Every structure is written in C-alpha cells, then in structure tokens.
Design a protein around this ligand. Structure first.
Ligand SMILES: Cc1cc2nc3c(=O)[nH]c(=O)nc-3n(C[C@H](O)[C@H](O)[C@H](O)COP(=O)(O)OP(=O)(O)OC[C@H]3O[C@@H](n4cnc5c(N)ncnc54)[C@H](O)[C@@H]3O)c2cc1C
Ligand SMILES: Cc1cc2nc3c(=O)[nH]c(=O)nc-3n(C[C@H](O)[C@H](O)[C@H](O)COP(=O)(O)OP(=O)(O)OC[C@H]3O[C@@H](n4cnc5c(N)ncnc54)[C@H](O)[C@@H]3O)c2cc1C
Ligand SMILES: NC(=O)c1ccc[n+]([C@@H]2O[C@H](COP(=O)([O-])OP(=O)(O)OC[C@H]3O[C@@H](n4cnc5c(N)ncnc54)[C@H](O)[C@@H]3O)[C@@H](O)[C@H]2O)c1
Ligand SMILES: NC(=O)c1ccc[n+]([C@@H]2O[C@H](COP(=O)([O-])OP(=O)(O)OC[C@H]3O[C@@H](n4cnc5c(N)ncnc54)[C@H](O)[C@@H]3O)[C@@H](O)[C@H]2O)c1
Lengths: 442, 442
C-alpha cells in the first residue's frame, strides 16, 4: 500500500461508518482503513452488556449476541469476507474497502498529503478521516503503586479487556469497580447478574454522590443508585481513594474517608482521553475547553482532513461547540464525514443520541445537551420536578429556557419527538404540556 | 435573482486583496465585491497620518499622498476604470471585477449558497469571502449623555470621518482625543503638527499610564508618550472619564480622581468591534476569546465560505489562534483566501506585520505576538540592555523562552530577518547575539 484515494485512521466505529457511507456515495471507491488494533472493526456496547447477559458458554469465543429485536448477530461490523486486502485494493475493479490491522499512523504530513506508519512505510492520500477515538484514563492512585498492584488492575475498552475480565469473574471473591460513569455502572450491573449465579462479591465506588451523577439530576442519580444496588452491587459513594497496596495477596484500598476495603481485582472507568497524538505532528488545533481535534460544523479540519467519533470536537449549529463519546454519534459523524469527503458539504444537523441500561428497571434514551450541571425539569407518572417514585418519565435540560437536552426515562420509540423539540427550540411556557407528547402513560 | 462565481463581502482592504489574488490565479475569473460603504475600495493608514502631513489645500479632495519613499499615488486601491459594472460582469469576455457600492449583505443562506441584500435582491454564489472588518466602539460615557454632546463627538475610520475632522481642525481651540493605542496616538500626532501652524490645542487622554501601553513594555510606553507630547500634545494618562456635559457651548469632562477639562470636539479611538452580524443568520461560529468569525488555518469556515481581515480569527500553526486588526494582515489574509478559493489549500504561513509612526522620532515595524502582557527583552544603541535613552533598538517577546513576537524600534528593512527568527523559533540562549543580526548601529 503506497497511495490510496480515501484513507481512514482508526479501526473503529466511526471509521467503518464513514467507509460504508463513502462507498455508497461513490460506488467503486477505494477506501483504506488503518487500525493499530489488530482486531477488525467492531462495535463496543455489547462488551458492556449483551455479551454478559448471554446464555452460551461459547459466547466469549463466538462474540455473537442476541439483539433487542430478538435476532442474533456478531459484534464485528462485517465478516472478513466483505473487506479486501491492501494489495488487491488499487486493482480490484469497482473498488472495495481494506483494513490494515495492527499498524499505527504516527506522523501526519498534512501539506504533503501523506502519513508515516510505525513500520516506517508511507501512504499518500487524496482525502483523509481521523477516527482515532480515545484511550481510557488510568487512576493516578494506581499509577503511583507498583506492578504488584497493576498486575491485578485493568481498564476496559476492547475485546481483550472483556475476555480477561469475564475470566476473572469466575476466579475471585471480590471485584471492585471505580467510577460513576456509564461504564462503571454498566459493568457493575453486568456482574450483579453474575453475582446472582456465581455468588461473587461486586462493589462499585466513586467519589461522587450517586451513579451517573454528571448526566442525571441528583434525585434521579440516587434512585438509579438504588436500582443498581438491587441489581447486586455494594455501592459506596463519596469514596475519594487514598492509595492501593497488597494485604496478604489481596488488594487493599484506603480512603480519606478513613474506611478501607479488600478485594481481588480492580477496573477503572474514569473517563476517556481522546487520541490526539497526531495533532502536533500535523499542525492541527485542539479544542482546549472540550478536548479533541477542533473541527467545524462539517467535521472538517483542513482542506482534505476530517475528524469523527470520540476524537472530534465540532460546531453544532443548533447547540454550539461540543464533543461526543458515544456510539450512535460515532456512527452519525462517521457517515457524515464520508458524505463530506465525497463533496456533500453537509453540517451536523441530524442529531445523534445514546442509551444506557442498568438492570431491567433502568433503560433510557437521551439526546442533545444532557448535563446535570444545567437546570432540569423532570416529569413522571404516578432544578424542578412534577409527579417519591421516578420509574417512568422525561427530563428536560435548559439553556435560556430552551430545551437543549432531553432524557427519555423508561420511555421508548419516542425519540423522533424529542428530536423535533430540540430542533424547534421554542421557549416552551408549559413543560407539562410538552411532556404529554411523550405518551408517558401517566 | 442573479448569480456570481466569486462573491466578496465588504468593500475593504482584505476584499480587494483577495480579488486581485483570485484574478491572478484564474485569469478571466468573475469577481463581485459588495460594499455597504458607498466608497470604492481604499486603504486607511493615510487617514491616520500621510494625508495630514501633506503640503496642499486640495489634499482633502484629491486624496493623493506622496510617501513614504517619495512617489505619489491615490488611497483608492485603483481607479474606477479597472473595475467593471455588475451588469457587464457575467458577460464581459475574460472576466473582471465589479464593486457594488452602498449595498449591505444582510442575510447569509449558507446551505443555499446565497445572500440577500438590504434592497431585498438575491445573489447566489460559488465561493464566498467574508471581509467585513469591524466598526469602532463608542464610549459608554458618551452613550449616556444627550445629542447636545454627541453632535460634537466623532469616532473615525472612514474618509467621511477624516474630512469632517480636518475641517474641525480649522474651526476650534481645543480637540480632545481619547484612546491609549494606535489611532489615539497616531491622530494626536497629526494634530500636534497642525498645532505648530494653526496654534490649536490638542490633548490626548486615556485611563492607562502611557501610549501604546498594551503593545510596548511600560518603559518604552513612557519614552514614547514624551515623544508624542513634544509633537504638540497635552497627554493626560489615567484619564478615567466620568461623564460629559456642556459648559457654555463648550464640552466639559469630569474624571474619577476629580480632575476636569474643557474642549470643543472629541474623537474616540477605543477599539474596534468586528462585524459579525452575518453569523447568527448563517450559522457560523464566533471565537468568544478573541472575537470575530472562527476559521481554521486556511481562513476557511465552511465548505464554500472563507473569512479575512479584521473580521477573521484564525489558527496560526506557528503562534496559535489569534485575530489581527492591521493593514498588512488584511492584505495577506485577503490574498491568501483568494488563493484558497481557487483551490490552493495553503495555511497561514507567511507572517503579516504592521508599523506605526508617532512624529519623526518614533517609526517602527513589528511582527508576531506583540503584547506587553508577555515578558519582553529590549536591546538598544550606544529585562533590558541599552548597549535612560531608547531611540533605536529591537525588542523581543517571549513564550516559553521562544521568540514569538518582535518589535523593530527605529530600525528599517530588517523585517525578513525578524521573520526568520519568529519562524525558526529556537530557544535563543543569548538574545544580545540575536540582536546583532539587526544592525542596530547604522
Ligand atoms: C464497553 C463500552 C460500552 C459502550 N456502550 C455504549 C452505549 O451503550 N451507548 C453509547 O452511545 N456508546 C457506548 N460506548 C461508546 C462507543 O463505543 C464509542 O463512542 C465508539 O466506539 C467510538 O468510536 P470511534 O470510531 O470514535 O473510536 P474507537 O471505537 O475508539 O476506535 C478508534 C480505533 O482507532 C485506533 N487508533 C487510535 N489511534 C490510532 C492511530 N494513530 N492509527 C491507527 N489507529 C488508531 C484505536 O485503537 C481504535 O482501534 C461504549 C463504549 C464501550 C467501550
Ligand atoms: C485611519 C486608519 C489608519 C490605519 N493605519 C494603519 C497603519 O498605519 N498600519 C497598519 O498596520 N494598520 C493600519 N490600520 C488598520 C487597517 O487599515 C485595517 O485593519 C484594514 O483596513 C481592515 O481591512 P478589512 O478589509 O479587514 O476591513 P475594512 O477595511 O473595515 O473593510 C470592510 C468594509 O466593508 C464594508 N462592510 C462591512 N460589513 C458589511 C456587510 N455586512 N455587507 C457589505 N459590506 C460591509 C464596510 O464598509 C466595512 O468597513 C488603519 C486603519 C484606519 C481606519
Ligand atoms: N453510552 C453508554 O451507555 C456508554 C456505556 C459505556 C461506555 N460508554 C463510553 O465509553 C467511554 C468510557 O466510559 P467512562 O465510564 O470512562 O465514561 P464517563 O466519561 O462517564 O466516565 C466516568 C466519569 O467520571 C469522571 N472521573 C474523572 N476522574 C475520576 C475519578 N478519579 N473517580 C471517579 N470519577 C472520575 C470523568 O469525568 C468521567 O466522565 C466513555 O466515553 C463513555 O461515553 C458509553
Ligand atoms: N497599525 C496602525 O498603526 C493602525 C492605525 C490606525 C488604525 N489601526 C487599526 O484600526 C483600529 C483603530 O485603532 P484603535 O487605536 O481604536 O484600536 P486600539 O484597540 O489599538 O485602541 C483602543 C484601546 O483602548 C482601550 N479601550 C477599549 N475600550 C476602552 C474604553 N471604554 N475606555 C478607554 N479605553 C478603552 C483598549 O486597550 C483598546 O485596545 C484598530 O483595530 C487598529 O489596530 C491600526
């Protein structure tokens, strides 16, 4: 591989999305992906959920799962057979898509329209997408302790990290998870379900007051916390860790609080650092407020260079500048980039979204500026709230008395409406009136 | 309904620059400018100084000037005869450039690739440049007093504002200028030279401690202040104006400390608000840190939309994100945009610059990050190293012990060198050594 028309950087969700899009816009286009992950492109959400819930003892080899619709499919976006090899790519008639596993792009000659790989080799391109996502944070209290401790502490983002943990599930008494994040919460709840069978101890802790405390209003944060617990976790909020050593071949955690806890294995879901290493070498701007590559509303950075997924900080003409670490986003932005690389010139209009599930009694969808820092208004059946019990409802997020963000709590398929509301952006006088549009079944 | 290939918005310096550039890159291109000023495109720095120094009582009609090498020319970038009419433009063989005077562009349909004028009419375009510069600030203490006072208070940035003032020069005792910086000082010194003939009073005041105190180190700010004075101006630093009323048909100004001053006419040079009114309607981002339209290093905002001059906040790959209100910049950025509209894809590399002249004993050039807030090092003729008197030298501006900005104080033609230094951006160990590269002596 020496020169390719369409180069995508990163073997991830956004990259695939873009590639499918490009191919549809110019059939017989020639798209090369470049993944440092030696794994072919695959979706992540199952790792935190579906794979765990599976009734199959081959699950962790097949990596198939069963869908919300009921049907069964693989986490790979495609079987190896759809893709082609790099050697074949410039030659195979009517184009194709190559993925090139386990090579990192390490330098970006923007002006030369070219890149150097970690193996020294060089590819010149016509249009390029950066889709490098991010890489999870380590905790600095883990960074400080020695490899007698990091031997039994993992991070979670890839299949490797899953299989490893799924195994560790069937090998210890106690697994301790840190973070109020979706990942921390989503995982704890995966293990609470193993706890019901394997009788294993599961503990989530985090220095904040409740689960998802950063995206949900503090009341709902709590309610949720309870639901997690019941799912089967010992949830310890306000856990500002001190340090971690060993106590007879068993990890021990001290905290300013003064309490302390023994366990076997740790997982840290404490955010994600976007992968921006290519910026310096390319002469590309970073958004210092939000992190990640700075791009415009069309996801463009420079004449031939676009950015997408968790790596991309973009102007949302509607909601303003932001950056989004979520699946559906990475798909949208990917698809979008792909259009714009084929001359679409479309800005980010169709909004993206996300979901989470924490035991069967918490499943929600959401969209736009979802942030507990902002003033919210929750509306349920049977900083303001209307109609003890919050099992089903909808929550609004406001800037200047306009709905900038919506959460649909245990309400499903009503996304299209939420979209229309966010989009119209009226200054709704009566939110109770709006809430009826989401047939809450009050 | 009508349509032009290359549309430029604003009848200014940047717009012209771009148009000349475009025409050279695609001869027989068809470029339409759109000025809300009814005046054809013209350069401004003469109003500040060259036209006042002229030995002619027709000066203010011809608008010719005879500087700064000795040759004679007009402030219009060119004679009406080079440009063409709009009607002719789509038809005239081998293109041409039309200016369309006294129409404002008031709406921007980015997606539709079109604009509405204030007269309701509509132009669709293929590529567009925004070149709207800015509009000078009023003082809020003037805003509060009534049209008795505002009748005799101007702020000036256009020929209209010059002719008016040049007249007022030969009609009163006292003219009071307010503004610590460029235009403030540059005007005061125009009037000190009339003071030597017309025997008129001239007074500059401003709440800061010295002239140009924001771009020069505070010692040199002072030294400069003195030089102004001798030019013939009563300089009152720390003015801190309180309010303005009349005292027997003569304007009177009170100040926080307690002091007060009578005068006939006021001019306010207190900064410039960039013209961004098209952003909301177009869905274009504003840089809130620096002000103005946010663009990338290629001056591009969206697929077919570029920005330039004082309006444009851009990524300088070398020096970072910034925005610049200066002539040579507006020319560069204009030229550059024009290249990128014809597919150049060049980022902002060749640095831009500026100069100022405050009486014959202060004439300087400068480049890059010139800002007294930053640490500086001055080096003069025989931190600071003068081998009391600062008549000739060079001043360095530092971030992380790298030269990010340079001022050449009474040193001429040595710009190319300064460029090389800024550009190489070494961590120069001995600045005295660097200072020799500019032959301070002779
Ligand atoms: C366990 C889990 C559960 C999740 N659940 C949800 C959910 O329920 N809902 C939701 O909305 N979102 C969820 N997400 C988030 C979603 O998976 C991400 O937003 C998405 O994967 C990001 O895709 P991307 O293409 O931007 O980056 P990534 O998926 O990170 O792909 C980037 C790829 O590029 C590689 N790469 C990095 N640098 C280079 C380089 N220089 N050269 C070549 N390759 C490079 C990376 O190693 C990686 O292989 C979840 C994520 C995880 C991990
Ligand atoms: C008196 C004076 C002296 C100066 N001296 C110096 C100097 O000595 N050295 C130096 O480096 N710099 C100097 N400058 C700065 C320099 O002249 C300006 O920075 C430069 O002219 C800006 O060019 P521009 O093309 O960005 O905008 P402008 O020259 O402001 O041109 C834009 C114009 O286009 C029109 N316009 C605005 N909005 C719209 C719209 N919506 N639709 C249609 N038309 C519109 C308006 O007439 C507007 O003023 C001086 C400026 C002035 C005023
Ligand atoms: N959409 C989903 O349902 C879903 C599910 C799983 C993962 N993900 C994504 O995968 C990525 C990894 O997930 P994550 O859990 O890191 O998301 P997250 O970003 O919610 O992580 C938890 C949050 O805790 C904060 N934090 C920082 N330091 C901390 C500390 N020392 N202790 C406790 N909290 C700290 C971080 O701001 C972080 O945002 C994220 O981008 C997330 O968006 C999404
Ligand atoms: N290169 C040149 O020599 C030259 C000459 C003429 C004009 N210009 C450009 O045209 C514009 C006009 O010049 P200018 O002197 O007005 O700009 P300027 O910003 O240099 O001068 C005004 C300064 O006064 C201060 N100020 C702001 N608001 C104030 C207030 N309410 N009260 C008191 N002080 C206040 C600020 O420091 C501001 O920078 C500028 O953008 C300038 O860069 C440049």
């Amino acid at each position: 591989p020496s020169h390719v028309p369409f180069l995508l950087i990163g073997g991830g969700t956004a990259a695939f999305a873009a590639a499918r899009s490009i191919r549809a816009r110019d059939p017989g286009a020639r798209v090369l992906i470049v993944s440092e992950d030696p794994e072919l492109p695959y979706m992540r959400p199952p790792l935190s959920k579906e794979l765990w819930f599976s009734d199959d003892p081959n699950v962790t080899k097949t990596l198939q799962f069963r869908q919300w619709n009921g049907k069964e499919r693989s986490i790979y976006f495609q079987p190896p057979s759809f893709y082609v090899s790099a050697q074949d790519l410039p030659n195979i008639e009517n184009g194709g898509v190559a993925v090139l596993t386990g090579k990192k792009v390490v330098h970006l000659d923007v002006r030369g329209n070219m890149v150097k790989l970690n193996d020294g080799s060089q590819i010149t391109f016509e249009k390029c997408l950066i889709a490098t996502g991010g890489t999870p944070r380590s905790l600095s209290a883990i960074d400080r302790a020695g490899a007698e401790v990091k031997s039994r502490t993992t991070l979670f983002r890839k299949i490797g990290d899953f299989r490893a943990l799924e195994k560790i599930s069937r090998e210890v008494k106690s697994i301790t998870v840190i973070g109020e994040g979706f990942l921390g919460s989503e995982l704890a709840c995966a293990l609470g379900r193993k706890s019901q069978a394997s009788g294993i101890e599961v503990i989530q802790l985090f220095p904040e007051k409740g689960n998802m405390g950063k995206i949900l209003p503090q009341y709902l944060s709590n309610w949720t916390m309870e639901k997690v617990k019941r799912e089967g976790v010992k949830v310890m909020p306000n856990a500002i860790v001190q340090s971690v050593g060993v106590s007879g071949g068993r990890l021990l955690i001290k905290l300013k609080d003064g309490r302390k806890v023994e366990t076997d294995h740790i997982v840290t879901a404490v955010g994600l650092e976007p992968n921006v290493e290519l910026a310096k070498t390319g002469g590309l701007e970073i958004d210092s407020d939000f992190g990640g590559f700075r791009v415009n509303a069309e996801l463009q950075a420079r004449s031939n260079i676009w950015v997408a997924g968790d790596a991309a900080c973009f102007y949302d003409i509607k909601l303003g500048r932001r950056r989004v670490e979520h699946h559906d986003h990475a798909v949208v932005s990917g698809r979008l980039a792909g259009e714009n690389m084929t001359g679409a010139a479309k800005p980010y209009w169709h909004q993206s979204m996300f979901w989470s599930d924490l035991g069967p009694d918490v499943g929600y969808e959401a969209i736009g500026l979802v942030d507990s820092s902002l003033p919210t208004v929750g509306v349920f059946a049977k900083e303001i709230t209307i109609p003890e019990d919050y099992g089903k409802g909808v929550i609004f997020y406001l800037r200047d008395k306009v709905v900038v963000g919506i959460v649909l709590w245990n309400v499903f398929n009503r996304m299209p409406i939420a979209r229309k509301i966010i989009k119209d952006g009226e200054q709704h006088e009566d939110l109770n009136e709006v809430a009826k549009l989401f047939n809450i079944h009050e």
